[PDB]
DNA sequence: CTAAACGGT
DNA sequence: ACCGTTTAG
């Protein structure tokens, strides 16, 4: 029973990506604040940031 | 494409 | 929490 696949708002993405630009890795508090600000789960943001780095690493 | 899962660090 | 790799909405 898979977790239901998230669909991010344009705005969410936008602000995520903005975060990722500023900082490629977030403290736990930073993660939490962001999650709140975007009305996402810690885990939502966490996984997002991972796959994001994962893609980043595909450029570097 | 990419969010989520898996298993080992 | 993360990585790398893989699974699947
Ligand atoms: Na680090």
Numbering used by the authors: 232 to 291
Question: What does the publication say?
Answer:
However, analyses of the formation of TF complexes on DNA have revealed that many TFs also bind together across the family boundaries, in a DNA-dependent or DNA-facilitated manner. Because the DNA-bound TFs are fixed at particular positions relative to each other, the contact surfaces required for cooperative DNA-facilitated binding are very small, and can evolve rapidly. We also generated an unseen test set by solving six structures that represent several TF–TF–DNA complexes bound to optimal DNA sequences.
Recently released versions of RoseTTAFold (RoseTTAFold2NA v.0.2)39 and AlphaFold (AlphaFold v.3.0), which can predict the structures of protein–nucleic acid complexes, performed much better in predicting the overall geometry of TF–TF–DNA complexes. For example, both RoseTTAFold2NA and AlphaFold 3 correctly predicted the two homodimers of BARHL2.
